[PDB]
């Protein structure tokens, strides 16, 4: 089932994942986007080091300017890789949401509000992920894991 690690966390939030992200693992995040929000992101990291900055296996970056979009990338040795931009974004300012990230053998599958949103192939072994961080303009109601 689901096991939240925090409720109404102050943002930015950086927490350690209680178990290994093996295929089949679900990460659930419920929150709300403020009316003035420009962007926010959910980063799956290897450690919480800030200098040198910890590798980010999966960077999920919803942006709200223009028509909006979702930027996904990977950070290795403080170097970003090739961006994967998703334009059919379900996120909206002043609207609550529920993000579900499925960990599959070769990629992450993200659904928002019960509807598939995007996929992202692993660039870093998922077993190296033990930290989850949330930054930017967003209100988080809960972060949980279904191992
Ligand atoms: Cl797969």
UniProtKB/Swiss-Prot annotation:
Binding site for a carbohydrate: 63, 73, 83
TM spans (from-to): none
Whole-protein residues included: 7 to 153 of 317
Protein's UniProt name: Galectin-8
Entry note about domains: Contains two homologous but distinct carbohydrate-binding domains.
Localisation: Cytoplasmic vesicle; Cytoplasm, Cytosol
Function statement: Beta-galactoside-binding lectin that acts as a sensor of membrane damage caused by infection and restricts the proliferation of infecting pathogens by targeting them for autophagy. Detects membrane rupture by binding beta-galactoside ligands located on the lumenal side of the endosome membrane; these ligands becoming exposed to the cytoplasm following rupture. Restricts infection by initiating autophagy via interaction with CALCOCO2/NDP52. Required to restrict infection of bacterial invasion such as S.typhimurium. Also required to restrict infection of Picornaviridae viruses.
Organism: Homo sapiens
Lineage per the UniProt record: Eukaryota, Metazoa, Chordata, Craniata, Vertebrata
Domain annotation Galectin: ranges: 13-146
Domain of life: Eukaryota
Subunit structure: Homodimer. Interacts with CALCOCO2/NDP52. Interacts with PDPN; the interaction is glycosylation-dependent; may participate in connection of the lymphatic endothelium to the surrounding extracellular matrix.
